[PDB]
Structure 1
Amino acid sequence: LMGPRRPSVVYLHNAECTGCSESVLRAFEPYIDTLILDTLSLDYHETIMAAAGDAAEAALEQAVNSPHGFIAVVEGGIPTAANGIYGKVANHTMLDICSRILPKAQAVIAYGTCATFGGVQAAKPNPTGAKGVNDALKHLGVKAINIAGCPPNPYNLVGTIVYYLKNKAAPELDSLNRPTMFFGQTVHEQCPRLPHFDAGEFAPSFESEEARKGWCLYELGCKGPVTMNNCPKIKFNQTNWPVDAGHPCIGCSEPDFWDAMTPFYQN
């Protein structure tokens, strides 16, 4: 799967919806073909790899044990209730898999709010005892770089990997272990509706003429003021982002947002 030349990436899927994997396929300049063929060696990824079953497990083993080292990118939370049985691959629990592989990586990136902070399956009452990677594996010394969002901007993943490959180190990280170069500003301070906010001009409903005219969505629940992400700047798919589509920010790059930010349509 790899050797010298391209750095090896092992991509793991835990308790996830595959939205994070899909976000990476939306990679733009560079595109995912450039990334898979020229930048990196994607040596394990269950969504797109050719091998299955035992052949897939052997590819993983091959990749993790390589003397050249590997970077791990992790999607999804780790179910820990009942000894991890709510999530298994190859009849091993996700907890066990991550416990064994992640301490061997040269670097670990937790990609998406599920892997960084626990995410949707960790929302109350958290029946599977889902945890973010760093929470789950604290005791083994794992310190993943957290790239949050549901899903994150793929610009942020590629940017982080490129930094690491250039500098052989993580970029500056905030107190939630997120790169400051992407998560240093609130959504709100970057938002085109901030003049309306400042003027106290709020849409009272989605049907209102105030909404039509692009007034601030705070009264309709917008979590922009309490959410750290680069959405208004980079946008998504090179063309839009939630508030420009008329909908409040739901706070999706923040820990426990499912419980902290709800009800989504209230402030």
Structure 2
Amino acid sequence: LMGPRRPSVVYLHNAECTGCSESVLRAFEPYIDTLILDTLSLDYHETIMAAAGDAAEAALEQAVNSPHGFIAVVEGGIPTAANGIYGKVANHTMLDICSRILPKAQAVIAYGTCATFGGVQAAKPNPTGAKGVNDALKHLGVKAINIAGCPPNPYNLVGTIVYYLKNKAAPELDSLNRPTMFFGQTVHEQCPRLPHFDAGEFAPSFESEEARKGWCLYELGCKGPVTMNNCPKIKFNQTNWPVDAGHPCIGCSEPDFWDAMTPFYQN
């Protein structure tokens, strides 16, 4: 599926909504066709690969056991309750699949708040015992680079992969194992509404003239002050981001944000 030449990537889907895979398809300069034809070798990816069934399982084994090595990109949390049965692929639990494959990777990237921290299915009461990759697989010494967000900015995945290929090492990581080059600043310190925040100029409701005028969304729940991400800087789809669309940040690159940041419209 690979050999020499382009670095092999094995992309795994655990408990996920496929929003992170879709985010990668929005890659811009480089675009996803350049990434899959020129930069990397995408050797397993259930959303877009041609093979299915046994043929797909074969492609995966071929990629994972390659003497050339592979990088694993992991989307989705790992359900661990009831011995992992809430999530299976090819009738193997996702916990077993990841336990077997990820220790063999040259590097692992957890892409997605679900993969990094457990995500939406880990929110209380977590019926499937979902865990982020490093939590689930700590005992196997897996230390994935965490690229958080729901979904993350694909700029952040490509930037991390390019760095890794250049330098042969992870970039500086924060205490949640996220690259500081992307997660080093709060959304809030980068926000265009910060002068209103400083002045105590808050929109009291979404229908208000203050909201129309672009006042700060803190009283409507904005979690920008407690969220690390590069959203106001890079934006999404080369054009917008939540506060510039008038809606508070919901904290989506932070661990446990479904429970920590809720109710989303209170601070």
TM normalised by structure 1 equals: 1.00
Percent sequence identity over matched residues?
100
SS of structure 1 residue aligned to 2:72: strand
Q: Hey, what does 2:200 align to over in structure 1? A: 200
State the 1:85 CA deviation: 0.0
State the 1:47 CA deviation: 0.1
Q: C-alpha offsets along residues 65-113 of structure 1, whole Å, 9 cap, x if unaligned?
A: 0000000000000000000000000000000000000000000000000
Unaligned runs of 5+ in 1: none
Q: Distance in 2 between matches of 1:112 and 1:15?
A: 11
Q: C-alpha offsets along residues 108-145 of structure 1, whole Å, 9 cap, x if unaligned?
A: 00000000000000000000000000000000000000
Q: Distance in 2 between matches of 1:155 and 1:140?
A: 29
1:101-112 → structure 2 map (5 Å cutoff): 101-112=101-112
Q: Distance in 2 between matches of 1:77 and 1:4?
A: 31
State the 1:54 CA deviation: 0.0
Q: C-alpha offsets along residues 23-61 of structure 1, whole Å, 9 cap, x if unaligned?
A: 000000000000000000000000000000000000000
Unaligned runs of 5+ in 2: none
Q: Distance in 2 between matches of 1:202 and 1:4?
A: 56
State the 1:171 CA deviation: 0.1
State the 1:15 CA deviation: 0.1
Q: Distance in 2 between matches of 1:21 and 1:172?
A: 24
SS of structure 2 residue aligned to 1:206: coil
State the 1:183 CA deviation: 0.1
Q: Distance in 2 between matches of 1:92 and 1:107?
A: 23
SS of structure 2 residue aligned to 1:243: helix
Q: Distance in 2 between matches of 1:71 and 1:241?
A: 30
State the 1:174 CA deviation: 0.0
How big is the alpha-carbon RMSD for the aligned residues of Structure 1 and Structure 2? Answer: 0.1
| Residue 75 (str. 1) matches residue 72 (str. 2) | no
Q: C-alpha offsets along residues 152-197 of structure 1, whole Å, 9 cap, x if unaligned?
A: 0000000000000000000000000000000000000000000000
Q: Distance in 2 between matches of 1:188 and 1:92?
A: 42
SS of structure 1 residue aligned to 2:146: strand
Q: Distance in 2 between matches of 1:171 and 1:104?
A: 20
